[PDB]
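Quarterly update, task 2.4: S-adenosylmethionine-bound model.
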Amino acid sequence: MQPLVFDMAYENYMKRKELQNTVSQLLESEGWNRRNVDPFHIYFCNLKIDGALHRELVKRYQEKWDKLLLTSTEKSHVDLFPKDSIIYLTADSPNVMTTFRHDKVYVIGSFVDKSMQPGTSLAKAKRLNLATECLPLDKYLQWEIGNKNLTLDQMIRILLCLKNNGNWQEALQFVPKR
Ligand SMILES: C[S@@+](CC[C@H](N)C(=O)[O-])C[C@H]1O[C@@H](n2cnc3c(N)ncnc32)[C@H](O)[C@@H]1O
């Protein structure tokens, strides 16, 4: 089964409100995955034991934390999968995605910043020499803009649709317009 990584290396950038939002978005994402008959194997990487995120899950969502269908680890995506197979997703990337690939491990940053902290994830990728891509939002949604920095549950639904052989118009229905 194809892995999909949520990178938990952003905790230091967030306040109590935004960390909470991140946790809400991750729970929602795992739920969309459980609905699908051809799901991803979800990995929570860089999840520091007894950090703010792990503590938030354990103190405030213990019942829900014990039943998620995923693998969580302190290790990095680069410690587990070969660098050649990694693609870090970020709206700041200069490479526009054209093709969903079944032999790649996509990485999504676990970060709610309200577009106030650009480049953050692009740099975390460059520093380890990882390939990056952005979603083709301009190409397939001229005007209707909104902000191009989507939520974590939006990203998984798009990628699920493409994984299950949907075209770009179908996949991008999950993007709120205006
Ligand atoms: C709210 S965004 C975070 C924006 C943050 N300032 C950053 O530096 O990425 C949440 C995550 O979803 C992914 N993402 C969001 N919108 C995307 C897009 N248009 N293309 C590719 N990845 C996207 C990225 O992995 C990003 O880390």
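Highlight for this quarter: Residues 16-35 form the longest helix (20 residues).
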